[PDB]
Amino acid sequence: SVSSFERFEIFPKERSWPNHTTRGVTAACPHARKSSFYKNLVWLTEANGSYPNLS
Amino acid sequence: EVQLQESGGGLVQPGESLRLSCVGSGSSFGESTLSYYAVSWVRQAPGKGLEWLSIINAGGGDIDYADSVEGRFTISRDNSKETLYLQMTNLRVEDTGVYYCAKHMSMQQVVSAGWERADLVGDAFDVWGQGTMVTVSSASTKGPSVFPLAPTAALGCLVKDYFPEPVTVSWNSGALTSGVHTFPAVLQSSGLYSLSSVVTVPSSSLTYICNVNHKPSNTKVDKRVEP
């Protein structure tokens, strides 16, 4: 039970994680023949052989 | 790291076909073999620069080609064999050159983790093969003629008449690895290539031989060089 409820971009994907890879997808979560991921999360991964510290 | 070895090229008649193979070996970070990455073929014509031909992604998707080779050439990969392919058809004389196999930097999938990259990056080529040469010419192949160059000092080998490139020179199986000078070949007036190879030796003389290898004709010569 909610009086109100709205969804918003807490951490905008490309702008929030410049130094990590954000385009991770999985065959476990397929949408539209192709394989994708959750709509509200980001599978952050290494970028340029480095996973910088994150805060 | 990952190493790459093209193979399967040589001399073929115009309008014919030829299939180059690119074999991967070794692994980069996280035991990533070649099937983790996206690969491209890149050719180089004699004396010119680098031309990109086609790209394929790790899983075998997102194929694309350069307009100059679209319809004739076809890229593919047997990840079980960690091998890439380039099926060339209707070969034209300008297709002659050194065909390279080049891996793209970014990791595109990690299959056991169930992780893929949504896009195809196609970024820097951090690993290249030694190259395999494709010579498109209706001229017939002919074996090399080798003659000695007897004698700090100097002794040599004259590979007089052959077609087409390339040959492989190695004096006494790399014994003389200092001071060598395998000279760039020239195209003689007849129409067949010529080439000399030399090494510097001092007053001391020991026997010296040159090992010649011409792939397209099963030619292997260990010619002597006595005064």
Ligand SMILES: *[C@@H]1O[C@H](CO)[C@@H](O[C@@H]2O[C@H](CO)[C@@H](O)[C@H](O)[C@H]2NC(C)=O)[C@H](O)[C@H]1NC(C)=O
């Ligand atoms: C990223 O964070 C880790 C820990 O969260 C840092 O690791 C420390 O590294 C120093 C050496 O630089 C060690 O003396 C410490 O023992 C490590 N742990 C901690 C808790 O400090 C790491 O240095 C950070 N990276 C950068 C570039 O600052």
